[PDB]
Amino acid sequence: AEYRNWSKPQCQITGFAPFSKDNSIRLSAGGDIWVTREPYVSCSPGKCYQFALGQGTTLNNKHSNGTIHDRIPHRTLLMSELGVPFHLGTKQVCIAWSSSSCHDGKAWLHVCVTGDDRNATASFIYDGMLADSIGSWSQNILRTQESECVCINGTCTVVMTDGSASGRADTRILFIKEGKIVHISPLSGSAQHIEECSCYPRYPDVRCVCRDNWKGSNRPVIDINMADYSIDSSYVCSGLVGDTPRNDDSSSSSNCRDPNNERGNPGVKGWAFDNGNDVWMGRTISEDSRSGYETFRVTDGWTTANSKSQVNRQIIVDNNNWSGYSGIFSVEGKSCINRCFYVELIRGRPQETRVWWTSNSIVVFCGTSGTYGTGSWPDGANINFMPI
Amino acid sequence: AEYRNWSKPQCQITGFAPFSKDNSIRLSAGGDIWVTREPYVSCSPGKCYQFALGQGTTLNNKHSNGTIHDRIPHRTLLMSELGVPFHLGTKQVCIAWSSSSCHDGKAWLHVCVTGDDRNATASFIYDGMLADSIGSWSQNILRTQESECVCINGTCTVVMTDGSASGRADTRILFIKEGKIVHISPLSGSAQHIEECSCYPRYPDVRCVCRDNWKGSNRPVIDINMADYSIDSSYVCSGLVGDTPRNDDSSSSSNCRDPNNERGNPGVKGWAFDNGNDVWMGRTISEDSRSGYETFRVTDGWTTANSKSQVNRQIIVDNNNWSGYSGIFSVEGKSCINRCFYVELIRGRPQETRVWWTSNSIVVFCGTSGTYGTGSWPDGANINFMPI
Amino acid sequence: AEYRNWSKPQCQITGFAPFSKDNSIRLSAGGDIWVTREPYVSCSPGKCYQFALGQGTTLNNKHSNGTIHDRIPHRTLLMSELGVPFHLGTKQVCIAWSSSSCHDGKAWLHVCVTGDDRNATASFIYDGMLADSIGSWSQNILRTQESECVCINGTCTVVMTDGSASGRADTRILFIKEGKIVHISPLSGSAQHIEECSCYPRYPDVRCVCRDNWKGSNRPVIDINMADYSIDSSYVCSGLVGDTPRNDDSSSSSNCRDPNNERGNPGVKGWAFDNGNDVWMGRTISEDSRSGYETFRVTDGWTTANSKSQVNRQIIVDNNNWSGYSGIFSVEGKSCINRCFYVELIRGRPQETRVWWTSNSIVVFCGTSGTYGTGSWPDGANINFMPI
Amino acid sequence: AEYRNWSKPQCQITGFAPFSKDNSIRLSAGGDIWVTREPYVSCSPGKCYQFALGQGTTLNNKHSNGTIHDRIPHRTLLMSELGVPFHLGTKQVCIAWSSSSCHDGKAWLHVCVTGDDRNATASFIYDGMLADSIGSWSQNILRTQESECVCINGTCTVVMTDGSASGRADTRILFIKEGKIVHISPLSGSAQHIEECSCYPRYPDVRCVCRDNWKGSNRPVIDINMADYSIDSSYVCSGLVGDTPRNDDSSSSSNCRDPNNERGNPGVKGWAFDNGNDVWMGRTISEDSRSGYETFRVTDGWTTANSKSQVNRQIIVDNNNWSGYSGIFSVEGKSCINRCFYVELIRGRPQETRVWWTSNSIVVFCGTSGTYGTGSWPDGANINFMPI
């Protein structure tokens, strides 16, 4: 086995087609299934896996009470083949309340953060072995992507932020080789309060679309040069913005350079990617809350400030149903690199108070250059049928 | 690994021998097992798998209520090694309320249809990656075989129908290479309403025996030329007809060319195959309902209109037990190609109203050129022992 | 991969050491575990598996009621790695109420008998594919070994009896090559009623020690010539006899040639093997019932009629606990072939009537040339803690 | 594959980073999970596994009652990939109420002791086969390490003790090659009572740190010459001692040569390792009971009697939570050999009497040469939420 390079152009797509759905919450009502959140998807060259942060309990279990809290010592990174639900035989790959994973063509790298909020440890696990670690550098909360990292030619890159709810954010970009940290670069350019990057290979570089936690409903973009470790950043140009909350479509804006100061907090993890002058992106259908999900393309939305010219809309989850985080992953075909995405479907607290638990399922779609129809693919659990 | 060609003569069989049984419903009464329907079986060169359309729930689970409905967004295609029941570690391979799968010698192809009734999407997944998609061409329930597709020399063929189950039904035959659609041919010949084809290789071509949903209790036959993509069709010659409902054996008929207009609707998925002038075929034992199952050969039943000369009858499931859909799969031996079949054993609604769910198990038989005995292998669950 | 030949001498042993235990019944009281009987063990060159005939149900399940009956259509052959209990992910390899399995160095062969009592079918499954079948030749009850068959240089041999409670037994030895029956030899020599052979390779031939159902508490022996397909048979010489029931040790006998006419019915499946003039053997501790288990060597017990000279006795299961069938399997080391055995530990009906089910666990021991101590390794479940 | 030699220097570590946690007890309250104790970890060159001694039952199962008792015939050695909890599909690798395991670069060796207290058997299983066995030499509870053995160049070593727990016991060091015992050496040097050694490679030799059961709260050290089979022993020099119970830090001592006679009984399994003149070690935080866990380095604590100079402390489990046994394992990187450890987190009896069972989970950490933060990673189960 050789290192992956992702050295192919991006597939020209017309939209997205259904790929996978796990039905975790529906299954939790008649079986032993992990309580989770912050899922994502990543593929080795041989196959695709779903990941998530467990809460150290199954759902029909009294320890599921209070699982809205993000950071406890019992959280571990779960890894299962895509489509296989998170049952009791699922592997806990490392201890983590924040994570990122990727495969370099030879082995899996996992970045796993756990410990005290303000003095955390990030472990780097390469090929099933502990290879390196780093402590929190600012003693705010050290956190990472909650989606796949990206490796080119044996060098993997991951974005991390040591930040706090007060809008403090010290963002650094790590370069890692067989689990060893070989360089760390500070964030540079105009992006301001970066969390939870969704990154993708754009050979010879890497590009991330992130979450502005504090001041922008427009999404930050980071460019990472894999050859000399230099960094740049800005915001997605599209006047149809990707975060939640946000203004409505006729009053929303972006100038490509600065956070837009429109309903900037708290934001939600999401994704977007460039196709020439155009941008493909997802977002929640609601402007206020994490409900529904839609994808579309914005013509000129990548290079012209404030374009609002959409086309190729699809509903993924209708607006009567809960969504959550979303993110990108990439797949190498014979001649081109395809872009896919997942949507976290959160059930329970805080929106549904009949139960005491918090958990999610997922749905996944992939780029197609064929044709397709319409639908809606929500979580599908009836909250009244669940353990409490 | 090379592509499969199926370029051997058909095994001369004397009947069928027991091969596999999954006991799903019996197991569902003391364990977490998936609710399913529309199962089938397909073998790679290395092993066999069972497939089915899940209902996004286990059986001992309140979400099993109402699983008589065919099309919900939570249906996924389940895949498990043959004989491993559909438990909670089962892989959901794609989102689907109608499907077909086959292995081309290198990798698995799955065809997965989901979404709105009037605007569905069919996804094509090859080697674990999304390779193509199509949208509905008549806007009235795009649907496919619910059994294995067939590949020769890297080209896979699958039959799909869209449109009104009564009138203006539009059947198309797709040709697919590594998951990309390379050609689509319209149905041609005298077959009139086609659904749920059971197909098999007949080198260098492919042949399918289908279900006439509307006017015929005699089964349609479709021939598919894999060299030039041309199509022909007619009806199985045998005066002993294969659909349900049907007339009794002394008043049933077929003229090879047209639907017989004898109790044509609604039909059931089934199979048949040719051996020279003879046909081997399965059907339900009851002429009225989906109860029992029997196989036999009809001498001259392939090439002479209205032959009623049977031999080699076997009871697979006795007429005191429910059956369901059935279909064919093929297996390559060292010197010949064998034919096998599966029977869906449907339990619950509509026939059994003590419970609120609908599900199935399977039983599977394969051609033999040896000797064999008799028996009956029904589902075996006691409806009174079940969750409700 | 090449075919196995088992062309190594037998390891010289001093006794047996503990190898595996599955604890099935103890686990069944707090988990979903298959109901089974007639287990055995067999190893491919890479690993060992435990096998058993399921009853189409888990134990904590209302379908476990009435599982004392030996022959229903829902019985399937279960296969799991040795030490992994028979849980819901266990593979049902074929449909069977009697079976035998073995690995030829390239693939698994399973012999699986199911159907009507008096008109059964035996299927032969090689490398996951149905390769042949045979019907009952006498229309009594067709049955096979309930332990491993043996393959040498690509030819596998298995012993089958088509027999009935009226002392009738038509015994045949089959020779099978990649799942095809290539020859069938009748039983020959002085053994009279043969059931449930425990067989082992003894290069270039195969040797079996069986159960006499009717006239002998001394065990029949069969020799199988793998070059010309000829057969011979006789009875184990040892005056300490291996069947149950049997006379006590001072009044028991064998003349090497004939059944001893001492408490000959019904017997139990068991094993023995030769080491020069000596025999190693197991048997129940009780002379009346299937309780306890012990092993020992009888000096001159293989070649001198009526030798009662035991040495190296070990208790495996003490005489306050239920045993059951036992059998032999063989393991290829780098320089020699070791002999190992399993004991079925039957719980429930008919001996324990608080419950309505019958099932078993197993314990497994292997030949050692070292030293060892003492113990007792029974099933260990408390019948009062079980589902009913 | 070649034999492992561990012929690299020890990684220069700055402390330990989080690696794995299994959450067994928390899962256990809503799922079928094995009752265990005496866990450990060991890695093949390809992956890591967790091991433990099962109690022949799951926790939500009436057979869990009374599982404080250490030695029953139903105890088996459980083996699972690190992070996969001990669920019903877990492999039981051998029968054992005491064990040790290790990989020599080609295959797994397991040492498994079971049977009567006064006449036990130790089985040696190599590459899934029984290879050798030994009987008890002092007739008073033959027992071994409860952590990984160590192999260099194909020869594996394991330390065993038989005889009175707190009298004179008879400790022997076994040398094993492909499962065959090739030499046994008696303990030699000044160590007096030895139990439950934690051993590691220190090329070309092996070094163990053990438990003095009777007279010392300072830990015995054994040196094992792998080429010559010669043995030496003494006590860890550090005045900060590693056993439990022990005196407080200002009145504790060690003279490197003798047990310190300070609260010597009963002790607990633990570990330490040398780095030049320094020692790295773990211990319980409490001096009286098995509560909490901490690691640190003692400067000059390996070569100067009574050093109390600690640095680089880390809390692993805080002192409001139960700990248990701990031990070491080693991992081969590209340029150096890393040291890792596990901690057993015991729940239930005798400390927690609301329930009738005893079981544990684990947490695992590995050496790092990077930086890290702080935390506490206890078991996390609420005793009030558990089956009784």
Ligand SMILES: *[C@@H]1O[C@H](CO)[C@@H](O[C@@H]2O[C@H](CO)[C@@H](O[C@@H]3O[C@H](CO[C@@H]4O[C@H](CO)[C@@H](O)[C@H](O[C@H]5O[C@H](CO)[C@@H](O)[C@H](O)[C@@H]5O)[C@@H]4O)[C@@H](O)[C@H](O[C@H]4O[C@H](CO)[C@@H](O)[C@H](O)[C@@H]4O[C@H]4O[C@H](CO)[C@@H](O)[C@H](O)[C@@H]4O)[C@@H]3O)[C@H](O)[C@H]2NC(C)=O)[C@H](O)[C@H]1NC(C)=O
């Ligand atoms: C079966 O399923 C298919 C596949 O899912 C469905 O087809 C979808 O339908 C989507 C919804 O209609 C559609 O996406 C929309 O696209 C329009 C842009 O539409 C175009 O306008 C441009 C601009 O010059 C033009 O390029 C287009 O091309 C024509 O020809 C081309 C080929 O050359 C082809 O693309 C076209 O089909 C067409 O023949 C076409 O004219 C966009 O405006 C839509 O966005 C508005 O509407 C949605 C609601 O659907 C809102 O949520 C948005 O906010 C937005 O509305 C705002 O903006 C409006 C101003 O534009 C304003 O009027 C509103 O008030 C509001 O402020 C949306 O992006 C897909 O492109 C199409 N996909 C494909 C592949 O065709 C099909 O409908 C299904 N059929 C059935 C029966 O269900």
Ligand SMILES: *[C@@H]1O[C@H](CO)[C@@H](O[C@@H]2O[C@H](CO)[C@@H](O[C@@H]3O[C@H](CO[C@@H]4O[C@H](CO)[C@@H](O)[C@H](O[C@H]5O[C@H](CO)[C@@H](O)[C@H](O)[C@@H]5O)[C@@H]4O)[C@@H](O)[C@H](O[C@H]4O[C@H](CO)[C@@H](O)[C@H](O)[C@@H]4O[C@H]4O[C@H](CO)[C@@H](O)[C@H](O)[C@@H]4O)[C@@H]3O)[C@H](O)[C@H]2NC(C)=O)[C@H](O)[C@H]1NC(C)=O
């Ligand atoms: C143990 O297991 C085995 C294997 O399963 C069982 O063997 C089965 O048994 C099946 C039922 O009998 C049988 O299938 C039937 O086949 C007959 C055709 O049989 C032949 O008839 C022809 C000529 O017309 C004849 O020449 C044949 O030759 C004999 O001798 C030669 C020697 O050279 C040899 O080649 C042959 O093997 C045979 O020994 C032979 O007799 C067929 O007629 C049956 O069809 C009617 O019956 C079934 C009920 O069984 C009805 O449901 C059907 O609807 C059908 O009924 C129509 O037929 C009549 C004529 O019109 C009419 O009365 C009715 O009203 C109706 O209209 C059926 O298909 C298998 O062939 C046989 N398999 C084999 C391999 O032998 C065995 O029975 C089991 N034993 C026990 C003890 O349980």
Ligand SMILES: *[C@@H]1O[C@H](CO)[C@@H](O[C@@H]2O[C@H](CO)[C@@H](O[C@@H]3O[C@H](CO[C@@H]4O[C@H](CO)[C@@H](O)[C@H](O[C@H]5O[C@H](CO)[C@@H](O)[C@H](O)[C@@H]5O)[C@@H]4O)[C@@H](O)[C@H](O[C@H]4O[C@H](CO)[C@@H](O)[C@H](O)[C@@H]4O[C@H]4O[C@H](CO)[C@@H](O)[C@H](O)[C@@H]4O)[C@@H]3O)[C@H](O)[C@H]2NC(C)=O)[C@H](O)[C@H]1NC(C)=O
């Ligand atoms: C710890 O564990 C070990 C191993 O598990 C225990 O030592 C076991 O003990 C077994 C039980 O005693 C024993 O098996 C017995 O063997 C005797 C035969 O004993 C031998 O006699 C021959 C013949 O002259 C002689 O060669 C032997 O000398 C030595 O050399 C051999 C080398 O080949 C070696 O095995 C030893 O080193 C050995 O000392 C030796 O003297 C046999 O007579 C026993 O069978 C009778 O007793 C049992 C009860 O155990 C009955 O159930 C039988 O039916 C049988 O009784 C019949 O015959 C009697 C004599 O005529 C008569 O009185 C009765 O009424 C009846 O008709 C039995 O098979 C093992 O060989 C020995 N194993 C080993 C490996 O050494 C040790 O006991 C354990 N310790 C503790 C404290 O638990």
Ligand SMILES: *[C@@H]1O[C@H](CO)[C@@H](O[C@@H]2O[C@H](CO)[C@@H](O[C@@H]3O[C@H](CO[C@H]4O[C@H](CO)[C@@H](O)[C@H](O[C@H]5O[C@H](CO)[C@@H](O)[C@H](O)[C@@H]5O)[C@@H]4O)[C@@H](O)[C@H](O[C@H]4O[C@H](CO)[C@@H](O)[C@H](O)[C@@H]4O[C@H]4O[C@H](CO)[C@@H](O)[C@H](O)[C@@H]4O)[C@@H]3O)[C@H](O)[C@H]2NC(C)=O)[C@H](O)[C@H]1NC(C)=O
């Ligand atoms: C985020 O996480 C990190 C990593 O976990 C935490 O950092 C660790 O913090 C611990 C706890 O403090 C440190 O361990 C302690 O080490 C003490 C010795 O180090 C200091 O003293 C020596 C000289 O004797 C100095 O040389 C040191 O070095 C300084 O400079 C060097 C550069 O050369 C750097 O290494 C350092 O960064 C410093 O800048 C240190 O200043 C050691 O004394 C201590 O042991 C006592 O304390 C504990 C409680 O912590 C007791 O339980 C224990 O019994 C010992 O107590 C006895 O000791 C004395 C007298 O004998 C008395 O004080 C007591 O009463 C008692 O009798 C412990 O081992 C650890 O080294 C450090 N790790 C690293 C890599 O730095 C961060 O704190 C955490 N941050 C936050 C914000 O949470």
Ligand SMILES: *[C@@H]1O[C@H](CO)[C@@H](O[C@@H]2O[C@H](CO)[C@@H](O)[C@H](O)[C@H]2NC(C)=O)[C@H](O)[C@H]1NC(C)=O
């Ligand atoms: C989850 O835990 C909460 C808080 O511990 C439980 O609610 C409490 O119930 C007790 C009585 O058992 C009251 O005295 C408290 O005042 C309640 N607190 C709150 C915040 O409501 C709750 O019942 C637990 N949920 C479940 C399903 O057991």
Ligand SMILES: *[C@@H]1O[C@H](CO)[C@@H](O[C@@H]2O[C@H](CO)[C@@H](O)[C@H](O)[C@H]2NC(C)=O)[C@H](O)[C@H]1NC(C)=O
């Ligand atoms: C399954 O669901 C059905 C309907 O979705 C339930 O039946 C209804 O129960 C309601 C509420 O009690 C009644 O008012 C209605 O008359 C019922 N509807 C129908 C169509 O009968 C049914 O009880 C559910 N079954 C189970 C076992 O939960």
Ligand SMILES: *[C@@H]1O[C@H](CO)[C@@H](O[C@@H]2O[C@H](CO)[C@@H](O)[C@H](O)[C@H]2NC(C)=O)[C@H](O)[C@H]1NC(C)=O
């Ligand atoms: C297992 O099945 C048996 C036999 O069917 C059940 O016992 C019978 O129940 C009938 C009808 O309900 C009673 O009238 C008889 O007293 C029983 N008949 C016989 C022949 O014993 C038994 O109840 C079942 N066991 C469980 C646990 O459900």
Ligand SMILES: *[C@@H]1O[C@H](CO)[C@@H](O[C@@H]2O[C@H](CO)[C@@H](O)[C@H](O)[C@H]2NC(C)=O)[C@H](O)[C@H]1NC(C)=O
């Ligand atoms: C676990 O088993 C123990 C041992 O029998 C039970 O504790 C005893 O309970 C019996 C009656 O059930 C009492 O008479 C004894 O006094 C108890 N013994 C001791 C030492 O306290 C206990 O009931 C069982 N626990 C559970 C949950 O079943």
Ligand SMILES: *[C@@H]1O[C@H](CO)[C@@H](O[C@H]2O[C@H](CO)[C@@H](O)[C@H](O)[C@H]2NC(C)=O)[C@H](O)[C@H]1NC(C)=O
């Ligand atoms: C199977 O597929 C291959 C690839 O298409 C075929 O390859 C050959 O056949 C072509 C058509 O006859 C030739 O003109 C090509 O040059 C040639 N290509 C290669 C790579 O050999 C092959 O014939 C097919 N085999 C069968 C039995 O249909």
Ligand SMILES: *[C@@H]1O[C@H](CO)[C@@H](O)[C@H](O)[C@H]1NC(C)=O
């Ligand atoms: C990547 O890596 C090596 C050197 O580190 C180089 O030789 C190789 O040719 C490179 N390949 C690609 C695709 O970048």
Ligand SMILES: [Ca+2]
């Ligand atoms: Ca924002």
Ligand SMILES: [Ca+2]
């Ligand atoms: Ca019809």
Ligand SMILES: [Ca+2]
């Ligand atoms: Ca007998």
Ligand SMILES: [Ca+2]
């Ligand atoms: Ca001590």
